[PDB]
Amino acid sequence: AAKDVKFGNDARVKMLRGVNVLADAVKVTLGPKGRNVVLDKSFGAPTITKDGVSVAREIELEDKFENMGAQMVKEVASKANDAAGDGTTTATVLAQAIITEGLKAVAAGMNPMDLKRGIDKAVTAAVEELKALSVPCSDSKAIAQVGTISANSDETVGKLIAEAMDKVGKEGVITVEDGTGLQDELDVVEGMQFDRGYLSPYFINKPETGAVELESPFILLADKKISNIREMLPVLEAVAKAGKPLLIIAEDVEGEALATLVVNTMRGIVKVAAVKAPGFGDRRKAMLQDIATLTGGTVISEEIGMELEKATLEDLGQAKRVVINKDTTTIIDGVGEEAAIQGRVAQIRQQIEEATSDYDREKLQERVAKLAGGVAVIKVGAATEVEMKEKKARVEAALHATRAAVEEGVVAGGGVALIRVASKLADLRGQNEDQNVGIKVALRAMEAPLRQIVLNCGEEPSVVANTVKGGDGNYGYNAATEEYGNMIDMGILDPTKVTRSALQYAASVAGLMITTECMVTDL
Amino acid sequence: AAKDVKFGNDARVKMLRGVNVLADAVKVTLGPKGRNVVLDKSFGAPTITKDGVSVAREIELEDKFENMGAQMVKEVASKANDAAGDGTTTATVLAQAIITEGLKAVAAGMNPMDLKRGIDKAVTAAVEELKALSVPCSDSKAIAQVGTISANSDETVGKLIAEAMDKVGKEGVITVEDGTGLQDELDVVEGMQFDRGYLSPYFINKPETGAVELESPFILLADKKISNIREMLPVLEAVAKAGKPLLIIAEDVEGEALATLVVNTMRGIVKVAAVKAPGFGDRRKAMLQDIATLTGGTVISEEIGMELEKATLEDLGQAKRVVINKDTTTIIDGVGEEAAIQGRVAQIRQQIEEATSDYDREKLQERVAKLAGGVAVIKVGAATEVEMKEKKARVEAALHATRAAVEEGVVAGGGVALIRVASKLADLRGQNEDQNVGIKVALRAMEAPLRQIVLNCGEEPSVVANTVKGGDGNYGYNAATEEYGNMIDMGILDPTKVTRSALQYAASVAGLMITTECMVTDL
Amino acid sequence: AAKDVKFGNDARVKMLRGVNVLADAVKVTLGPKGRNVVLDKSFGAPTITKDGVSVAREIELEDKFENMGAQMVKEVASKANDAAGDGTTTATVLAQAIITEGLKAVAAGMNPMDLKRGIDKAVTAAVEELKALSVPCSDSKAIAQVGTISANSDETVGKLIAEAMDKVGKEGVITVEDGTGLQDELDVVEGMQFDRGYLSPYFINKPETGAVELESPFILLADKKISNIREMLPVLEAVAKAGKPLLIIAEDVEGEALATLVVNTMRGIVKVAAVKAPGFGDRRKAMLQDIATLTGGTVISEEIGMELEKATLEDLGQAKRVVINKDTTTIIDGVGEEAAIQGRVAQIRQQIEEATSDYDREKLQERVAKLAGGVAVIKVGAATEVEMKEKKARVEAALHATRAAVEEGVVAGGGVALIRVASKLADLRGQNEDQNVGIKVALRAMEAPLRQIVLNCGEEPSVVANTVKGGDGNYGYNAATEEYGNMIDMGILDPTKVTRSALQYAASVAGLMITTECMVTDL
Ligand SMILES: Nc1ncnc2c1ncn2[C@@H]1O[C@H](COP(=O)(O)OP(=O)(O)OP(=O)(O)O)[C@@H](O)[C@H]1O
Ligand SMILES: Nc1ncnc2c1ncn2[C@@H]1O[C@H](COP(=O)(O)OP(=O)(O)OP(=O)(O)O)[C@@H](O)[C@H]1O
Ligand SMILES: Nc1ncnc2c1ncn2[C@@H]1O[C@H](COP(=O)(O)OP(=O)(O)OP(=O)(O)O)[C@@H](O)[C@H]1O
Ligand SMILES: [Mg+2]
Ligand SMILES: [Mg+2]
Ligand SMILES: [Mg+2]
C-alpha cells in the first residue's frame, strides 16, 4: 505494498529539508578551516578523514521523503566523483544552491520546466566559457600544487603525483599502491610500453575499468612468433606455479600460441595474457627484442629468426607488474636491471643517429620513448593501516584531477573560476521570464563554492565575494593565508575537468528534483 | 543501516567523557599506593591483577559515542603494549592529558590541525631529547631493579630476568614458561645457538613471531650433509612417534634431505625443521659437531667425512626445547649433559690457544660463545593456576622492557625523565600561536605520569612536581619511600624504549581524536 | 519553599538564553525593517505593540531562570524607555551584545569584576566622547527631522513640535490635545502657570501621565491656611456641582493643618486639586489676585478674613480648563475678562521696573512671566480613537526626544556616532587585561546596533559596518536609501540624550547580570 501518495507542495519541502541536512553536513567539511569528518565504525576507533564523500556515505534520514531528497542529491557527489575523482563537495554545494533557489521559485508560482531550461542554458554557456578561460598545466611544481589543492591540503601527495608525471609523463603509466612502508613514495620502475591490447577480451582481470593486471608475472618473449605448444610448455609450467601470471609477448599474438593461452587460463592453470610484438613487419621483431632486454630474458629474436623454442626459461623475464589495457601493454619494472635497460636505451639512441632517413629516425625514437618512457608508482604512506588506506584515496583522486589538468589545463581555484564565468553571463537571457529566473538561479549558485570556503574560514562571505567580483582575471581570495592575490601565482588551481563536472552534475540532479508534481512511497 | 549524524561540539564532549572514564579507571591503578584491579569472571572468583591492561580490557560504555572515545584511546595502551610490553598505563595518562587540553583548545576556537602539528613537533623533539638523556644498562642488580619497576613492584621477577640475561646475555635466548611449580625459577639449559634460519618458511610453528618452536624434539645431526632418504629413515621414524618434533642439523640444509622434510611434515608425519651446520666450508663441519656433542648423539662428523648414514639412532640427540627464528637455531638444554657440554667447551677453548693466527682464533671463539652462551629459562611462579598465569605475564613484560633497556639504556623512572625533557623544551615554538599552544599542551601532559604516581601515593601532585622540577638531572621522587633523591642511585629506572613508545602512541591517538568535524553512527 | 540551588555556571547560560530570546524579538522590530508584533488582550482584539517596548512586555519565558534573565533585560529597556522616551530597542540590542560577550568572558573565567569595571570605564569615556561629538541642535528643520524620526516618521509631527516649541518657548509649556482631527492646530491658550504641585497624589485624575486635568474647574482662593477639611467642605460641595472639579489655591498650609487635611482628604474622595499661591509673602498674595483676575473669580484672603467656607461656589471663579503637573500648575482660558487681566499685567510690569533690586526684579519678572506666558496647546488629529491615541503617544515621544535633543544637540543616527566613539575608545585601555577585555566588549557592543539595522535591511552588516567605519566624520548608512550619504545631510539624527541613555542603561544592567556566583531558584 500500500502506498502513501501526496501531492503538491508537501513533496518539495520534504526534499529540500533532506538535501539541506546532507549538504550542510558535507559543506563544512569543505574549507580548510574545518578539518576532517568522522565516520563511526562498528568496531574500534572512528575513521577520520576529510572527505566530503566520507560524510555523504553516512547520511540517511528517518523521514522517508527527506531521506529521498538526501539520497537524490547524494547522486551528484557520486557521479562527479566517478567522472573526475574530486570536487564532490563543490558539486554538493552547487546543487544545494540551485535546488534551494529553484524550489523557492517554484513555490512562487514559476514554471518548473522553464526554470530547468534556464538553468540548463546557463550551464551550457558557462561550460563553454569555462573552456575559454582554462589554461594548461606546467612543470612538476604546478602539478604538485594542483594535486595538493585537489587533495585538500595534502601537499605531499601533490608533489608525488607531479614528480611521477614528470618521470613518465602521461604516456607512462602512473599507478598507486599501498605504501611499502609509512611514507609517500614515488619511484619509476621500468615501464616499457608498446601498443597492443590483449588478444582475448576474456583476459580481463579483476580490474573493472577494462584492463588486466598481473603482479610479478613471468614474461615469455616469443620473439619469433610462437609455432608450437612445445616452445610454450617450459614457460607455461613455470607460470603454472601459482601467483605468477604469465605475459606472452610473441611476434604477434598468435593463433596457435594465443589459442593455447585462452584454453589453459580457461582451466585455471597458468593465468595468462598475450600481446603482439609491437608494430608490424620488421620493426616488430626489433621491438619484441626491446621488451626482452627490458624483462631480462633476451630471447633470440624474430629479427634473428630464432623461435619461441629458441626462447627458453632464460628467455622468460619478470616485472613487479604489468598492465594491458586500452593504452597498451605496459611492463612496470623488469628483471632486466636499470644498467641493462638504460644501456638498451643508449643502443637504440644510436640507432636513431644511424638511420638513413627521417622515417627510420621517427620509428626508432618511437621505440626509445616506449622503452624509456617508464612507469611511475605512487605508494600512499602507511602506518597505520587506516591512515594508509585514506592517504591512498587522496593520492588517487589528486592524481586523477592533475591528469585532467595536464590534458586541457586548470582554472583559478578557490571558487573564483565559476565567479568569473558567472559575471561574464550577466546578460544571458532565455525565452521568457521564468527561464530568466532559472538563469539567474544558476549564476547565483556559482558563487556558492567561494562563499562556503570563506565561511569555513570564519570570514564574511559577502565581503570577500564582493571584493573578488570587484577585481577580475585570476584575482581571488587565498583562504589559507587570508590574503587576496593572483590565484595562479599563488598556486591555487583546479583542473577544469573537476570544476566542469561539479557544475554539470549539480545542475543535472537539481533540474530533476525541481519538477515534482506528486510523490508516491510505501506506507 | 540508518545513521545518526552530528556535528559540531556534541562529538567532542562525547569522546572526552569516554576517554575520561577509561583513563580514570586505569590511572589509579598506576602508582603503588593503589593496588590491583579486579576483573570479573563468569565463573568462580574474580581475577586480581595489577594491570592497567586488565582494567582497560573490561571498559565498554553504554553511550555509543562515549564508547567510541574509550575504544579509541584504548588503542594507545594496546599499541604501546605490543611495541614495548610495558608502560600502557603511562601511555594512557599521557593520552588523557593531551586529549583533555587539546579538546579544550579546540573548544576555545583554536585550529585543530595546528594544535596537532604543535603536539607532533614537541613529541619529535622530545624523543630526540629522550635519546640524548638515556643511559645504558648495567649488571644483574640494575637489570633486576629495572625489571621490577617495569613489572610494577615485583622485585622477584626483576631479579630473575636480570640473572637470566647475566647467564646468556642478549645472545642466548631467554624464554618464559609456566613454572614447573610455584616458584620464580631461572635456569640455564644448554642453549647452543648457531646462525641459520629454517630451510623452509613453511616450517613456522605456533609462534606467530615467525619462528618455529619444538618441545623435547629429536635432533638429527647429519654431519655429513644428508645424501639419502635411507640415512634419514631411522631418525624420521623415531620422530614419527608423536610429540617428538625433529630438528635436522645437516652439513647444510639440503636439497635431498630438506625436500624430504618439507614433504613429510607436509603430510603430518614427523613434523620437522631443518638448518645448516653453522658457517660454511670447513668450520661448518667442526660446528655441526659441537651441536652433536651438545645434543648428545655425536655423529661421525662431516669433518671426518662420515655421513648421515654414519649417523644413527645414537646420533640422534634431544633437548627440552629448540627455537629457529630470525636469530638462529637455538637448542635449549641438550641430551648431552653439562659434563659433556662443559667438557666440549674446554676442548674448543684450547683450540683457540692452538690456532696459529688471529683469524682461526676469532672463528674458534665464535664457536665457544655459541655453544657456551646458553639459554635462560624463566618459569613464572605457580599455585594457583590463576596467579601463575598472571606472574608469567609480568615476567614477560618485565623481560621485554629490560631487554630494551639493555640495548640502548634506561632513563630516570617515576616520571622524571619526561619532566626533564619537558623543561628542556620550554623555548620550542611553531609556525603560529595555535601551534605554540599545541606544543605547550604536549609539554604539560609530560608531567601527568609523575603527578598521577604522586596522587596515587596520597601526596600532593603540584608540590612534588614543583620540587622535582626545582632540581635537575636524576633528581626525583621515590614514591615507595616518599623521599626525594637520585632516581638512578635508588634503582628506579625505565627502559627508554617504553617511555618513548608511551609518549608516541599517546600523541598519535590524541592527534587523531583532536579533529572531528562530524560524527556518524548507527541509529 | 524548597529551593533548588545549583552552580551556576549553568545559571549564567540560563540567563543568557533568556536574554537572547527577548533580545531577538526586540532587535528585529527595531528599525523600519522591523516587523509588526502584537500584544494579546484578554478581551477584544489584540492591541498593536508595535514598538519594541511593548514587545518586551509580552515576552515571558516559561523557564524561571530564563524568564528571570528575560525580565532583567526588559528592565534595561524600561529604564531607558522612561528616561530616554526613545531608543528602548537600541538599548536592548546593546545590552544583549554586551551580556553575551561578557558571559563568554565569564566562560573565559576572566574575573568578571574587571570586565564589569572595564565596561563601565569604556561607557564613561564613550559618554564624554559622545557629548563632544554631539552638536547642539537648534533648527526648525532640525526639529522637524528629529520629530519625523521619532514618529518613524512624521514630518508633520515634528512640525507641530517645532511650531509649539517656538510659540511656547522652552519655558512655554506644550500640551497635546486631540483636535477635531485630523488637523494639526497650534493655539496658545491664555493663562498663568505657577511652579507648584497637587497636595495629595491621590488627586490624580484621568490622565495616566501623573497629572490632573480639570474642565471648567471652580477656583477657590484662600489667603488663609486651611485648618481642616470641614472648612473646605462647603466650598467643595458648591464647587462640585455640577460635575465640576474644584481647584483650591491658598497661600500655604501649616504642617499641622496639612496633616489633618491630608488624612481627611486621603480618606475621603473628592475631586479637587489645590496649589499653593505662587510666590511667598505679599507677592504670593498679589499673585493669587492675578489668578483671580484671570479666573474672573475673586480672591479670598485670610487677611481679608473672608473664610473659604464663607466663600461660596459663586465666589469662586471658574476656569475653562486647568492642568496640574508636578513641575507646574496651569490655568487656561480663565473666565475673567482680558481687559482686567491686561491692566493687572501692566501694573505688574511697572512693578518690575519699580524694584530697584535685582532680587526684587527677578521676583517681579517671575511673576509677570508666569501670568504672561500662558500655555500653548498642540492638537493632534482626532479619530479614530484608537488611531488618535497611537498618534498622540508618538507625538509625545517625538517631543521628548526633540526637547532633549535640542538642548544637548543631536548626533547622527544610524549608530554611526556609537561606532565613531568606539574607535577613539579603543585606544583607551583598562587597568588590567580583563578590564581591557571588558572595554573591548563595550566597544564591540556599540558597533552591533548599526549591524542590526543593516541585518534588518538584509544587507550584510559586515560590509556596511566596515564601510561605515572607514568613513570618518558623519558617515553612515541610510536604511531607506540603502545608499551611503551624510547622516546629517540625510537628516537622520538620533538624539544625544536618547543614545546616551540607552548605552548607559544597557551597560549597567549587563554588569549586574554578568557575575552570578550561584543562582538559587525555587524548586
Ligand atoms: N587549502 C585550500 N585553500 C583554499 N582553497 C582550497 C584548498 N583546498 C582546496 N581548495 C578549493 O576548494 C575547492 C574543492 O576542493 P576540495 O578537494 O577541497 O573539496 P572537494 O573536492 O569539493 O571535496 P572532496 O575532495 O571531498 O570531493 C576547489 O575550488 C579548491 O581550489
Ligand atoms: N615501586 C615503584 N615506585 C615508583 N615508581 C614506580 C614503581 N613501579 C613502577 N613505577 C613507575 O611507574 C611506571 C611503570 O609502572 P606500571 O608498570 O605500573 O605502569 P604501566 O607499565 O604504565 O602499567 P602497565 O604495566 O599495566 O602497563 C614507570 O614510569 C615506573 O618508573
Ligand atoms: N533610514 C534610516 N537609516 C538609518 N537608521 C535609521 C533609519 N530609520 C531609522 N533609523 C534608526 O532606527 C532608530 C530609531 O527607530 P526606533 O525608534 O524604532 O528605534 P528604537 O528607538 O531603538 O526602538 P523603539 O523606539 O521601539 O524603542 C535610530 O537609531 C535611527 O537612527
Ligand atoms: Mg576534492
Ligand atoms: Mg607496566
Ligand atoms: Mg524609538
Cis before A150 (ω within 30): no
- Cα A228 to Cα A233, A310, B360: the distances in Å are 9, 11, 58
Which of A135, A166, A192, A68 is closest to A513 using CA atoms? A68
C-alpha–C-alpha distance, residues C193 and C376, integer Å: 11
Contact C152 CB / ligand 3 (< 6 Å) = yes
> Between A and B, how many CB-CB pairs are < 8 A?
73
Kindly state the helix (H) or strand (E) to which residue C57 belongs, with its residue range.
helix C52-58
Cell numbers representing residue A408 in the block:
586541457
Under a CB-based contact definition with an 8 Å cutoff, are residues C286 and C188 in contact? no
The CA R_g of chain A, rounded to the nearest whole Å, is: 27
Ligand 2 atom nearest the C-alpha of B414 is: 31
Q: What separation in angstroms does the CA of A502 have from each of A79, A270, B32, B193, C245?
A: 9, 44, 61, 66, 84
Q: What are residue A522's DSSP bridge partners?
A: A3
Is B101:B513 a contact under the CB 8 Å cutoff? no
Dig out the grid coordinates for B409 from the structure: 639504556
Q: How far apart are CA B450 and CA B90, in angstroms?
A: 9
Please give the C-alpha separations between residue C268 and each of C235, C245, C262, in angstroms, as whole numbers. 15, 15, 10
Decide if C417 contacts C497 (C-beta within 8 A).
no
Instruction: For residue A504, give the nearest of A130, A27, A101 by alpha carbon.
Output: A130
**CA dihedral defined by C470, C473, C474, C476, rounded to 10 degrees?**
10
| Residue ID of nearest Cα to ligand 3 atom 20 | C87
Phi first, then psi: give them for residue C105, nearest 5 degrees.
-60, -40
- Helix %, strand %, coil % of chain B (to 5): 50, 15, 35
Residue that the C-alpha cell 600502557 belongs to: B88
Find the helix packing angle between C64-84 and C385-408, rounded to 10°.
Answer: 70
DSSP conformational letter for C61: -
* CB contact (8 A) between residue B518 and residue A59: no
Q: Which residue has the cell 623452509?
A: B200
Residues making up the annotated binding site of C are 29-32, 50, 86-90, 414, 478-480, 494
Q: What is the DSSP letter of C326?
A: S
H-type alpha helices, C335-481? 338-354, 358-373, 385-408, 416-427, 433-457, 461-470
Tell me how far apart the alpha carbons of residues C334 and C347 are, in angstroms, rounded to a whole number.
19
Calpha distance A244→A238 (Å, rounded): 8
Q: How far apart are CA B256 and CA B199, in angstroms?
A: 12
**Is residue A114 lining ligand 1, measured as CB closer than 6 Å?**
no
Report the distance separating Cα B132 and Cα B125, nearest Å.
11
Cα(first)–Cα(last) distance of chain A, in Å?
A: 8
Q: Which residue type sits at B421?
A: V
Backbone angles phi, psi at C466, to 5 degrees: -60, -45
Q: How far is the CA of A149 from the centre of ligand 4 (A)?
A: 8
Beta-strand runs (E) in B304-439 = 317-318, 321-324, 329-332, 375-380, 410-412
- Residue A38 phi, psi dihedral angles, 5° rounding: -110, 140
Resolution rounded to one decimal, in angstroms: 8.5
Method of determination? cryo-EM
Cite the annotated binding site of C for ATP by residue number. 29-32, 50, 86-90, 414, 478-480, 494
Where does residue C88 fall: left (phi above 0), alpha (psi -120 to 50 degrees), or beta otherwise? alpha
Pick the residue of B16, B116, B517, B523 with the most A CBs within 10 A to test the interface with A by mutation.
B517
The nearest CA of chain B is from the CA of A67 a distance in Å of: 10
Q: Which residues contact C105 (CB under 8 A, 6 or more apart)?
A: C112, C115, C434, C437, C438, C441, C514
Q: Considering only CB atoms, which residues of chain B are within 8 Å of chain A? A: 1-3, 5, 7, 11, 64, 68, 71-72, 75, 111-113, 509, 512, 515-523
Question: Which residues of chain A lie closer than 8 angstroms to C460, CB-CB?
Answer: 460, 462-463
Please list the residues that pair with C221 across neighbouring strands: C249
**Nine cell digits for residue B267:** 603430510
Give the largest CA-CA distance in chain C: 79
Chains A–C, number of C-beta pairs less than 8 Å apart? 11
Residue in the structure block whose three cell numbers are 623555548: B427
User: Which residues lie across from C377 on neighbouring strands?
Assistant: C175, C187
**DSSP string covering A416-475:** HHHHHHHHHTTT---SSHHHHHHHHHHHHHTTHHHHHHHHHHTS-HHHHHHHHHHS-TTE
Distances (CA, A) of B349 to A490, B166, B363, B365, C337: 74, 21, 11, 8, 152
Query: Other CB atoms closer than 10 Å to residue B481's CB: what's the count?
Result: 9
For residues A515 and A112, the answer to whether their CB atoms sit within 8 Å is yes
Nearest CA to ligand 2 atom 1: B153
Which pairs with CB-CB distance under 8 Å and at least 24 residues apart come from C432-435? Answer: C432/C114, C433/C110, C433/C114, C434/C105, C434/C110, C434/C111, C434/C114, C434/C115, C434/C118, C435/C114, C435/C115, C435/C117, C435/C118, C435/C121
User: How far lies A285's CA from each of A366, A390, B2, C151, in Å?
Assistant: 14, 44, 61, 99
Q: Which ligand is nearest to the CA of A55?
A: 1
Measured CA angle at B192 (ends B188, B198), to 5 deg? 125
- Beta carbons of A25 and B5 less than 8 Å apart: yes
Q: How many Å is the Cα radius of gyration of chain B?
A: 27
